[PDB]
């Protein structure tokens, strides 16, 4: 998480704060037909 | 003060489509500046209060 911030700000030093790096998406995880009368 | 609000580009423009999300990168730094403006507005609301 330190780098995902460093990469976003295009900088290698970050100063004290809250920065929004990205987003967290949870990714995705009877009338029987009369065949008996014919067969 | 107003209501602090935040907008997600991918969820709004493209929803849950992956292909639209991939095509979205070609337009560049729009979303970055949109989110910067909204963050500045929110911090401004807190400063007002």
Swiss-Prot record, chain A:
Per the UniProt annotation, where are the glycans attached? 29
* Gene name in the database record: S
Described by its record, this protein's role is as follows: Attaches the virion to the cell membrane by interacting with host receptor, initiating the infection. The major receptor is host ACE2. When S2/S2' has been cleaved, binding to the receptor triggers direct fusion at the cell membrane. When S2/S2' has not been cleaved, binding to the receptor results in internalization of the virus by endocytosis using host TFRC and GRM2 and leading to fusion of the virion membrane with the host endosomal membrane. Alternatively, may use NRP1/NRP2 and integrin as entry receptors.
Superkingdom of the source species: Viruses
Protein name, per record? Spike protein S1
Subunit composition and interactions: Binds to host ACE2. RBD also interacts with the N-linked glycan on 'Asn-90' of ACE2. Cleavage of S generates a polybasic C-terminal sequence on S1 that binds to host Neuropilin-1 (NRP1) and Neuropilin-2 (NRP2) receptors. Interacts with host integrin alpha-5/beta-1 (ITGA5:ITGB1) and with ACE2 in complex with integrin alpha-5/beta-1 (ITGA5:ITGB1). May interact via cytoplasmic c-terminus with M protein. May interact (via N-terminus) with host bilirubin and biliverdin, thereby preventing antibody binding to the SARS-CoV-2 spike NTD via an allosteric mechanism.
Recorded source organism is: Severe acute respiratory syndrome coronavirus 2 (2019-nCoV)
